Amino acid sequence: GLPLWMGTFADLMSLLMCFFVLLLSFSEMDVLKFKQIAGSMKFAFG
Amino acid sequence: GLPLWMGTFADLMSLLMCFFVLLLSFSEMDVLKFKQIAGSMKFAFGV
Amino acid sequence: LATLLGLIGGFAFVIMAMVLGDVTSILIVVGGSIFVVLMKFTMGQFFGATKIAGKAFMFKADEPEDLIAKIVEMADAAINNTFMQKGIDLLVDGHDADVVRAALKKDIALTDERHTQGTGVFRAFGDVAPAMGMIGTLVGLVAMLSNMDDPKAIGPAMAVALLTTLYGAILSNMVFFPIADKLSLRRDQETLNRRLIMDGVLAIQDGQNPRVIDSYLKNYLNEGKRALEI
Amino acid sequence: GMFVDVTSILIVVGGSIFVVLMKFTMGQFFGATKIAGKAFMFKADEPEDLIAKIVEMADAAINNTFMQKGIDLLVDGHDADVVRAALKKDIALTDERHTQGTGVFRAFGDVAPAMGMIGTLVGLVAMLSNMDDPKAIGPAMAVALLTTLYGAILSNMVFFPIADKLSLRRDQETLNRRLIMDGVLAIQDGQNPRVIDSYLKNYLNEGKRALEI
Amino acid sequence: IGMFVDVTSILIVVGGSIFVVLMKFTMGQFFGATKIAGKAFMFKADEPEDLIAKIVEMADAAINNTFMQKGIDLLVDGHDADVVRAALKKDIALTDERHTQGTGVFRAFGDVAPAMGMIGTLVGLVAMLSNMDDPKAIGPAMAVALLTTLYGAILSNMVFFPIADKLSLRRDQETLNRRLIMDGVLAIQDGQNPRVIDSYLKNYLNEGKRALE
Amino acid sequence: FVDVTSILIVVGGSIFVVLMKFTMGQFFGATKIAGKAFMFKADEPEDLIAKIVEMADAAINNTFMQKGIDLLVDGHDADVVRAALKKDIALTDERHTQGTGVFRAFGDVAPAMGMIGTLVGLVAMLSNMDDPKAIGPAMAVALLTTLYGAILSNMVFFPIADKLSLRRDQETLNRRLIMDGVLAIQDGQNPRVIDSYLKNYLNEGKRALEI
Amino acid sequence: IGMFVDVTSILIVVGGSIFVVLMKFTMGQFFGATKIAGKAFMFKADEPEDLIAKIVEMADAAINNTFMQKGIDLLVDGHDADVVRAALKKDIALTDERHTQGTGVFRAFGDVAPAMGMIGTLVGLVAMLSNMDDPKAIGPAMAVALLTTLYGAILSNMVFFPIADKLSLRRDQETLNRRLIMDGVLAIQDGQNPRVIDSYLKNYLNEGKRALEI
């Protein structure tokens, strides 16, 4: 199988995902920064 | 032991979670949305 | 209280199935799972496993009580079941004890092997479903990252990709693994039934006392997972 | 308010019950529940009292069902073979019954966290999909967190400890039944009380009980 | 940079897996495992029914498969049953050992690949989070992390593990075929009737995974 | 960081689960054996070999050696003393196995209790959200529970179990050496041959690397 | 780059792993295991074919490997065949156990490192969350925790586990060569012709791992 530290790591990461989704749910993204990030990501992926 | 795919799952979660941290790098807190978020959380948890 | 537990189980399965139902997301998971499984089992064996699962989920096993009653009523005297009819025909045709024992034990081992193969196929499906769901989720993540246009379309789009992972989990813990577990339970039940038929047929052919064979049948009844029912 | 609590409870408990009911029949589950109840309110008869009772009968020649069965069989069955076989059958039946109960509760314990993770994923998908309605992400995170917490609590504090306590009770019952077996066999053989009392001493320090000394 | 990220992800995953496996297995062992996997994939194993028919044909009379040719040569060389049986068992053990080692090699590959995916993910995520204020720098880092995780998952679940179970299934088929050939050779040397040995060999048709009727 | 509530939650949950598994007396005996195997040191095998050679030349500090000598004084055959020593060795081995098992149970249970405490803390903070600036630090203390479990699952309980198993190996080696010495003494063998036989044990499954 | 180096993180990982391993291994045992790993990495195991050639070349006459050097020295000492067999078997078993315990030490290190990395990233996450007013300047505060996790993963997967696997491989090769040398010295003491022993020597060269080569 896998070591149990992997399970603890997965649970902690899912918990932090939930918390960060909550944090972002009441935050506004800068449109210019998001456009720059989108362009860089599109260039990186082909 | 644990399921063999759990590793990837942890990876995936971390991946996504880090992306959200990136999405929070250029974010701007909105007080009003926080207000109804807190109200909804209080209503949902039965308080 | 039994009705309450049955209702809660049915309601849980219904709500989880409605969460399952939404077309492509399940399709990637099932296609990947099938492709990975076919490296271990030929399509004929997979279809045989599905046949066995259907027969186990649609036809109830014959309870040991009616089998014991029928065996003892033939013993005092001297039918819908298949194996018992075959054994009865085998002894009435006229044969030694050893050949009948060998034939019925071969049939029992064949049933055990078939049920074990079905259990193995569905356990392989359960093992490989979440990994393929995760692969589908990662491909969806790549697509959404390569089509980054609107911030308000980040939430839902990601929620679609992650959806695939969910399906894998729902297919792994609520479909394939439960079917494997039910197949194992059906294998144990059918092994017990066939062993009881073995004992009864051997006693009838050997002309043993019906009382001792009745005690033997009760003793075989009082063992196994049934021990909790007493 | 109540909706998210019942949704989380439905996911976790209903999924666990559905999977176990596919695994174990309903009557067997109720038998396991009865076993757990009888093993959580009734303290096991400690072996020292059993040794005292056994040496009392040995010197001479209630409050224990197995001892009553053994003495009833001894009064009727003169040969030691039938008594030994029947009591070993009872010992094996009790062992298998407790093992099946432990298996049921451990099956619950393994199934529950998977349902907790599934509920977490459902809540996460709902939160990501809405992400804009305040009245739609509160319930989603309520479901996610409550399913994870209920899965963890039921797996590590309700079902696994009950299974472990059932295993402890099976060990204690096996020791008690074995001591009764030795007592009845000695009284059938007419053994001296002192030699059997010395013999049981190493039986006391078997396994877990070796830590106390 | 678009192809550079793909090259970097492939380098991380495949190079890490190769290095870790090479530390575990001899490099010629890796060649042997690759060759046996290629043979087990490109070629179809002889049907046991065909082997049974051929064996009963020679039994009545008293060869493309090499093991059958070796058995026939041993039988015609005027050797006793013990030496022929020992040689056939040694060949069967050698084949089983080769297939087990190949399965082990590919299982090691499939176990190491997700770990390299995790390492690449962590490297890419650190590169992103450290270069937060550089829009031109998080694209490649995110792409490396995501693609290395996806490649680890794909290689582990679709390329290496299924090859391992395919090698295990081919080991089962090879062992069954070689055992059938050995049994047929022993029956021919003993001199039994064609019908009884035909029935005995057809009894093997329902062994293991072949129950598909 | 330091939090009394978090460590109390982790230790209380772990103790409750283990007391469901083991009994209170067995847990206290496990703590006693851990203290005895930590604050004390096992006698060097070379010292025991020299001690047995000294008695071989003459014809007593360790309790097992004293017991063997006492059973040797009162004219006892090889079988009875061998059975008594084997019984004592098996009892000590099983006691150490029980201690290893209970500390393994503690190590396996602690992180789950940490995760449960973290989830409860997060639920409380979510149900009592008042100030945005306190959404960060609050979960911090919640995470303090999880970290604690991790530490207790990797720095205390698992190392204690491993040390207990190592001490079990050391004690079974020492008692096997004492058994061989008593057997040689009752056999009246030469000091040199038994010295070589005892020195053959100096390269056991853990002491070979010091060479 | 400086974003992948952190003194506190590597300190946490290495100190925790060393402290946990020292609970079950003495410092002398750890140094012995490190010496084993260094010797097995820097020196190459002698080819079995070369050893067979050297044995058959020295058979008719009546030096690199120390095992055969001690064998020929003991042969000059003229000990009994039982003494030769006992001493050679004892040396082979001692080397086998030494390599096995070196592998055990390195596997303990490899199994302990990622858990310490997880502890370190938990500490990093707590430190980051205790100093967050807005989720803006939490990039490097997450990078350091992920750095601890990456250190743990790298040390577990590419440094310690490969060393344990290489130690196991070297143990197998050393056992094979030791068995060949023991058989050769036994044959030389017996005085048989060089050719007869070679007939049965080469049957079992491809044992286990080497079974794939044919």
Swiss-Prot record, chain C:
Subcellular location: Cell inner membrane
Ranges annotated as spanning the membrane: 4-21, 22-39, 125-145, 159-179
Domain of life of the source: Bacteria
Main location: membrane
Cytoplasmic side: 180-230
InterPro entries: Flag_MotA_CS, MotA-like, MotA_ExbB_proton_chnl
Topology versus the membrane: Multi-pass membrane protein
Any Gene Ontology CC annotation: plasma membrane
Pfam family, any one: MotA_ExbB
Biological processes per GO annotation: bacterial-type flagellum-dependent swarming motility; chemotaxis; proton transmembrane transport
Keywords: Cell inner membrane, Cell membrane, Chemotaxis, Flagellar rotation, Hydrogen ion transport, Ion transport, Membrane, Transmembrane, Transmembrane helix, Transport
Assembly with partners or alone: Each stator complex is composed of 4 PomA and 2 PomB subunits. 2 A subunits and 1 B subunit are thought to form a single ion channel, so that each stator complex contains two channels.
Similarity comment: family membership: Belongs to the MotA family.
Role this protein plays: PomA and PomB comprise the stator element of the flagellar motor complex. Required for rotation of the flagellar motor. Probable transmembrane proton channel.
NCBIfam families from the UniProt entry: PRK08990.1
Protein name: Chemotaxis protein PomA
Species per Swiss-Prot/TrEMBL record: Vibrio alginolyticus
Gene coding for it: pomA
Swiss-Prot record, chain G:
Oxidoreductase recorded as keyword: no
Assembly and oligomerization: Each stator complex is composed of 4 PomA and 2 PomB subunits. 2 A subunits and 1 B subunit are thought to form a single ion channel, so that each stator complex contains two channels.
Lineage: superkingdom: Bacteria
Membrane topology: Multi-pass membrane protein
InterPro entries on file: Flag_MotA_CS, MotA-like, MotA_ExbB_proton_chnl
Species of origin: Vibrio alginolyticus
PANTHER family cross-referenced by the UniProt entry: CHEMOTAXIS PROTEIN MOTA, MOTILITY PROTEIN A
Annotated keywords: Cell inner membrane, Cell membrane, Chemotaxis, Flagellar rotation, Hydrogen ion transport, Ion transport, Membrane, Transmembrane, Transmembrane helix, Transport
GO BP, one annotated term: bacterial-type flagellum-dependent swarming motility
Family: Belongs to the MotA family.
Transmembrane regions listed in the UniProt entry: 3-23, 109-129, 143-163
Compartments in which it is found: Cell inner membrane
One Pfam short name: MotA_ExbB
Segments on the Cytoplasmic side according to the record's topology features: 164-214
GO CC term, one of those recorded: plasma membrane
Major location (coarse): membrane
Biological role stated in the UniProt entry: PomA and PomB comprise the stator element of the flagellar motor complex. Required for rotation of the flagellar motor. Probable transmembrane proton channel.
Name of the protein in its database record: Chemotaxis protein PomA
